[PDB]
Structure formats: structure tokens, C-alpha cells
Design an enzyme around this catalytic site. Structure first.
Site, PDB file in Angstrom:
ATOM      1  N   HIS A 196       0.810  -1.212   0.000  1.00 30.61           N
ATOM      2  CA  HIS A 196       0.000   0.000   0.000  1.00 30.61           C
ATOM      3  C   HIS A 196       0.847   1.268   0.000  1.00 30.61           C
ATOM      4  O   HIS A 196       0.290   2.368   0.082  1.00 30.61           O
ATOM      5  CB  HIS A 196      -0.995   0.004   1.172  1.00 30.61           C
ATOM      6  CG  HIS A 196      -0.373   0.168   2.526  1.00 30.61           C
ATOM      7  ND1 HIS A 196      -0.220  -0.882   3.404  1.00 30.61           N
ATOM      8  CD2 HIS A 196       0.092   1.266   3.169  1.00 30.61           C
ATOM      9  CE1 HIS A 196       0.329  -0.443   4.522  1.00 30.61           C
ATOM     10  NE2 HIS A 196       0.530   0.857   4.405  1.00 30.61           N
ATOM     11  N   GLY A 213       3.126   5.891   9.528  1.00 30.80           N
ATOM     12  CA  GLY A 213       4.483   5.758   9.050  1.00 30.80           C
ATOM     13  C   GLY A 213       5.234   4.546   9.555  1.00 30.80           C
ATOM     14  O   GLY A 213       6.374   4.322   9.124  1.00 30.80           O
ATOM     15  N   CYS A 245       4.460   1.342   9.095  1.00 27.05           N
ATOM     16  CA  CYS A 245       4.324   0.142   8.285  1.00 27.05           C
ATOM     17  C   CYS A 245       5.654  -0.225   7.638  1.00 27.05           C
ATOM     18  O   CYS A 245       6.469   0.636   7.301  1.00 27.05           O
ATOM     19  CB  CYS A 245       3.241   0.331   7.229  1.00 27.05           C
ATOM     20  SG  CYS A 245       1.586   0.307   7.948  1.00 27.05           S
TER      21      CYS A 245
END
Ligand SMILES: *[C@H](O)[C@H](C[C@@H]1CCNC1=O)NC(=O)[C@H](CC(C)C)NC(=O)OCc1ccccc1
Ligand SMILES: *[C@H](O)[C@H](C[C@@H]1CCNC1=O)NC(=O)[C@H](CC(C)C)NC(=O)OCc1ccccc1
Lengths: 306, 306
Positions: free
Chosen positions: A41, A143, A145
Site C-alpha cells: 500500500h 508511518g 508500516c
């Protein structure tokens, strides 16, 4: 003596974290050999995340749309592919700090260390367990991930988790390093319910053994029980059922303390029915289930790593 | 969201740990520039530890009696001196992995990460607080001495603790990196009582603010109080008194949540008098005091390091 929620040393993983930017989105990547792994993503905009068609979104991205940065050095992306829910970016430079590593998909009840990162830089390390409903109770912000979970076996780092999302209930979900989600979750911003969160009974027993090793013996009673009679009580309190394999796994802890597993089960049964009555065990007022039998042996025997 | 007992990344410290052997005793040392720091009781035998005269014991040791090993490499000791309760061994090789570092003596209530080591190899990392009685509740076994506690400030490692001993009560004591013990302890194997272990009130308040930030608001009441009225209740439960400086330190957390410090004190007062009634806060059934206000801001804002 003493007992703490202990994480693995993070040095070998800190050298593998990079920053991955695609357009406006920035998250963390894992740099091993000449491949960077990151959540897919990263190619989404804020509006794409409601109902992303990742195949269609990836068609409009070329190698040069991915900016990979290792601190202040720039890695050139020479290839990209999607494997389930992770992107694999082939870079021109093999990571010189690549440790001996392995990808492993863990089972519920197993524990691992999380290196929380932002912009490719480590923020902190903590220990957690894969819950029976395939979530983790973590600490993640925007932030984060691409932060990874890992275990260490002497000199080999076993990567088992990559962070992707937070559920509306405040728990966290992610994938293994092949991009397959733990649990039935999907990487889109939609309402997704998690199942019932049960207590990992074999981990509670290991923690009670750690308590006895460290001098907390007030909860030991004069009763014993059977596996079937304990599980009947355990199920009522949303505890995972205990099996014969669990008894074998606890064997070494039972031999070291001289307390039979079924005798410890009887003590747990009393704690479940009558509570702890304001007392504590190893400084906790709840029954802790985020220590595996191996974690207990490892901490109470001083196992070290490379 | 979420909240975990988070340790600092240990990579910068892992590269400074060495093994120090003197005769039969082996413990850990800290290798910074061309100096190795280690506890001075490395020169003791098991019988010397009851009543050691460290000056007399050190006279019978030369440079070549100290074996310093960094993994599989041998460091040559070219000088040695005793500074309070630590030995400084000058070696022929400056540590190429020496980070930007500083020696700091911390105050009670402050937190730090411990890298537990055995034979100069990292075993695990965990977070703890210097208790008001100058002990720490750690996890240490035989051979763990010389393990260090540290904080990280962006790129600078602040070393604040070196482990020396376990008290008969199961708590741990050590020195700063200049060899001065925290508290009234001495490095001999004798009965040494620790004082009363009080609860770090300002840390509890920061943790309650972290709970509100993470959605736990059931404990918020409609009362307020005064500093003097709260401290009267706090002293009865062995809580540290709250001062105006503590109120200023909590200021940013109060502004972020919109809850005045004295209003939070009133909620704490109710929790101390009536208990938590079987409920939990951030997954704990006790009031946690091992998070400083800075720890809370750091975790809830995602501060990163080099
Ligand atoms: C990646 O850094 C980020 C991590 C989140 C941010 C808050 N805490 C975390 O763990 N992940 C996302 O933003 C993720 C992206 C999707 C494309 C999968 N979405 C997410 O976790 O949204 C939270 C949410 C979704 C649906 C309902 C309620 C909350
Ligand atoms: C150094 O590795 C070692 C660490 C101890 C071992 C058990 N847990 C620890 O933290 N330290 C010592 O062995 C230390 C050496 C003296 C010369 C200071 N002594 C110690 O901690 O003894 C424990 C004790 C002493 C007196 C009464 C009861 C217990």
C-alpha cells in the site's frame, strides 16, 4: 534472578531498515541482499486506501517512481514485483550488513520482537505474541508500516512479521515476509472485525513456572487435576485448551522445579475461579500469557546470540 | 495507537560489549575508544567476595592477567587502573564501532534500557526505572555483571548504569560508568538492606495520560484537588510527593489531552482509595510507574534515532 519482558537485541535488524517512498507515501522497507521488501500500500494515495485495486495501481508505477533511501544513501530500483501483499524492489546494491536470515510463518501463541521504525530509522524494540485471533497488541503510529517482527537463533535472524494496519479496536495486523496476512484480514481501510481473543494457556503455565523459579510460590495449592477437568474450567474463561503436546513442551520446566504439570494446572484452576485476591505474581496483577516455555528457559538460563 | 514497554534499539551498544576474564572469573566489559570498563570484582575469587580488600587484590595483578576478548579477537591490555568500583583497562586497539557516547549519572524515577549480556554476547534488552531506593528490578544471572544501561538521544548513547550485584531480596544494584554506586551499596557479598520502595507519582500520571491518548478514559472523574491535598493521600500509600516542577514537566501532556494536571491527580486519588475494581488500564491491573513523561511523548509521537 528476576523476570522481565525481554526483547531480542536489534542490532542485526537495524542495519536492514530503509526508507521507501512512492509519490506522497513513505514507509519502511527491509533490505536483504539486493531486494527491498515493503507493504504494497506504499503505492496508494489516501483516497485509494478505501477500495484499492492494487493490480491497476501498480500498472502506473515504474522502477523510477520508487525512492529507496538507506539513511543518506540512495538505492537504485532496477525491478519491482508484487508478491501477495508485499512489494519486492530489486535494487542495484546488495546490503553489506545482510545477516544470516530466514523467513518463517509463526503460529498463534509464539512470541517475537518488533523493531518499530519511522522513515527507515529505528524508534524502539518490544516483545509481543501472535494472539490466537492472529492480531498483535502493538504500538504503531502513522508511518510505522514495514516495521518487522523477528526472532534470533544464535546467529540466524528469523523474520516473521511485517506491519500493515491497525484495526478500529486498537489492535494490529500484518503479514509474513511472503506477503500473506496472518488471519483473515485484507489491506484496505474498511471495517474488519477480529475474532475472540483467548488466553494462551500454555504460556500462562510457563510464566507460573518462571514465578516459582523466582521465589513466588504462594499460588501453589494441594490439589491436582486432570487434563479434561482443567480444560472444562479453562474453556469457561476463554482459555485455550491444553493438549498432551503442551504437557511435553512444559516437561523441562516441570523437571527443573519438581512440580508436575497437572499440579500447576490445579493451581491455575484455583486462580481462575477465585482470582488473585489483590496479590501479585512476578509484579503483575493479571495472568501473563506473552512468554512461551522457550522464552522462560531462555531468560532463566542466560542464552546468548551472535 | 497502542502502548508497550519499549526499549531503545541496542545496535550501537552491542558493538561495544567484550568479554573480560581474570583468572577464573569472567564478566562483561564496555569497550569505548581504547578503554575497557568492567566491574572491579572481576579480580575476586569466590572466597574473596565475602570481604574483599580490592587494593590488596589488585597489587597481585599485572596487565597480562586480564584477558579481553571481542568475540574471537584478542585485545592486548597495556594499562589498568581502578576508579571507584570499576576497572579501566587500556587496550592496544581503539574500538572501530565506538559510537558518540556520554557518561551520565541518572536520578531516581528516570528510565533506561538494559542490554543483558553473558560472556560478552548480548542476550536481550529490556526497559526499567531507577527506583527511589536506588535499586532496579532487573533480570540478571551469574555472569551478567558488566551489562550496561543506556539511553539514546538521536545519535548519542548515554551510558548510565553498569550491573554489579543482586540483593538478597531479588532486586539489583550497580554503578554509573565512573564506578560510583547508586545508593548506599558496596560491592561485597554481605547482607545489605534496601530502603522503602516508593511509587514514582509523576510517572504514574504520565502513564494515565498515555491511557487517555489511547482511549482508556473510564477512570476520569468529576473531582479536582490541590497539590497539598493530593500529597497527603499520596504519602499514605507510599507515593512520592508531587511538586510544582512535576506539574511543569507534565504540561505538554496536559495540553495535548485537555486535562489539567490537578484533575488527573484527583482521578489518581480515587484509584488509590477505591482501587481499580477488577478493571484494567492499558492492559495492566496495577498502576505503572516505569514510564517517564518523556517516554510517553516519545512513544506517542514516534521519535526516532540514528
Ligand atoms: C502504515 O504505516 C499504517 C499503520 C497504521 C497507522 C495507525 N496505526 C497503524 O498501525 N497503515 C495504514 O494506514 C493502513 C493502510 C491500508 C491501505 C491497509 N490502514 C489502517 O491501519 O487504517 C486504520 C483503520 C482502518 C479502518 C478502520 C479503522 C482504522
Ligand atoms: C556478576 O555477574 C554477579 C551478578 C549477580 C549474580 C546473581 N544475580 C546477579 O545480579 N554479581 C555477584 O556475584 C556479586 C559480586 C560481589 C563481589 C559484589 N554478588 C552478589 O550479587 O551476590 C548476591 C548476594 C549477596 C549477598 C547476599 C545475598 C545475595
Amino acid at each position: 534472578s528476576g523476570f522481565r519482558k525481554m526483547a531480542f537485541p536489534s542490532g542485526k535488524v537495524e542495519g536492514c531498515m530503509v526508507q521507501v517512498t512512492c509519490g506522497t507515501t513513505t514507509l519502511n522497507g527491509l533490505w536483504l541482499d539486493d531486494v527491498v521488501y515493503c507493504p504494497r500500500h506504499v503505492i496508494c494515495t489516501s483516497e485509494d486506501m478505501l477500495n484499492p485495486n492494487y493490480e491497476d495501481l501498480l500498472i502506473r508505477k515504474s522502477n523510477h517512481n520508487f525512492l529507496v533511501q538507506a539513511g543518506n544513501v540512495q538505492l537504485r530500483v532496477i525491478g519491482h514485483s508484487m508478491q501477495n501483499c508485499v512489494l519486492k524492489l530489486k535494487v542495484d546494491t546488495a546490503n553489506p550488513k545482510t545477516p544470516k536470515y530466514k523467513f518463517v510463518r509463526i503460529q498463534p501463541g509464539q512470541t517475537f520482537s518488533v523493531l518499530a521504525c519511522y522513515n527507515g530509522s529505528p524508534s524502539g524494540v518490544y516483545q509481543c505474541a501472535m494472539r490466537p485471533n492472529f492480531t498483535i497488541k502493538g504500538s504503531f503510529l502513522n508511518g510505522s508500516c514495514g516495521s518487522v517482527g523477528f526472532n534470533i537463533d544464535y546467529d540466524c535472524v528469523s523474520f516473521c512479521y511485517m506491519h500493515h494496519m491497525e484495526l478500529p479496536t486498537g489492535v494490529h495486523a500484518g503479514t509474513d515476509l511472503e506477503g500473506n496476512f496472518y488471519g483473515p484480514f485484507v489491506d484496505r481501510q474498511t471495517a474488519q472485525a477480529a475474532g475472540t481473543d483467548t488466553t494462551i494457556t500454555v504460556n500462562v503455565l510457563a510464566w507460573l513456572y518462571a514465578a516459582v523459579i523466582n521465589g513466588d510460590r504462594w499460588f501453589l495449592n494441594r490439589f491436582t487435576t486432570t487434563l479434561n477437568d482443567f480444560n472444562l474450567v479453562a474453556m469457561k474463561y476463554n482459555y485455550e485448551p491444553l493438549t498432551q503436546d503442551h504437557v511435553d513442551i512444559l516437561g523441562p520446566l516441570s523437571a527443573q522445579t519438581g512440580i508436575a504439570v497437572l499440579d500447576m494446572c490445579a493451581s491455575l484452576k484455583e486462580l481462575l475461579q477465585n482470582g488473585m485476591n489483590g496479590r501479585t505474581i512476578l509484579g503483575s496483577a493479571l495472568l501473563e500469557d506473552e512468554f512461551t516455555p522457550f522464552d522462560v528457559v531462555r531468560q532463566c538460563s542466560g542464552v546468548t546470540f551472535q
